[PDB]
Symmetry: C2
Subunit: 80 residues, 2 copies
């Protein structure tokens, strides 16, 4: 599968959704200027590979201590 | 009730959780440096007033198109 789109400061983050941009050390940007690029995800039916640990309801440990699916993010200790 | 703590760039955002900082036009920062100040919320038992529309369950429209509670945020059109 294709890698998820790079986003945020220095492209250190990855798009987990159309409006979600996260990096392990950066945290998660939801609906901010940093996640603007991620809008392209809506035009790629191809699911992407982040390589992050699965979590919650079909989620992914998008960042340290944060579990996000394509539309939400929750603080999760298990993601540390 | 006390107003919620200010956070983010130019203090235009406010803390909805210990790790969540949002601004109507800025979007939401979950676990990012912008939300570091929000940790202080953990040492304030009393609830704060954000003056924002309710949403989901316990959630508040923290930003245009985003509903958040103390530990999570979700893209929500009802918040636009």
């Amino acid at each position: 599968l294709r890698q998820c789109l790079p986003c945020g400061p220095g492209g250190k983050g990855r798009c987990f959704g159309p409006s979600i941009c996260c990096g392990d050390e950066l945290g998660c940007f939801v609906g901010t200027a940093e996640a603007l690029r991620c809008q392209e995800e809506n035009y790629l039916p191809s699911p992407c590979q982040s390589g992050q640990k699965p979590c919650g309801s079909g989620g992914r440990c998008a960042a340290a201590g944060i579990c996000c699916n394509d539309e939400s993010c929750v603080t999760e200790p298990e993601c540390r």
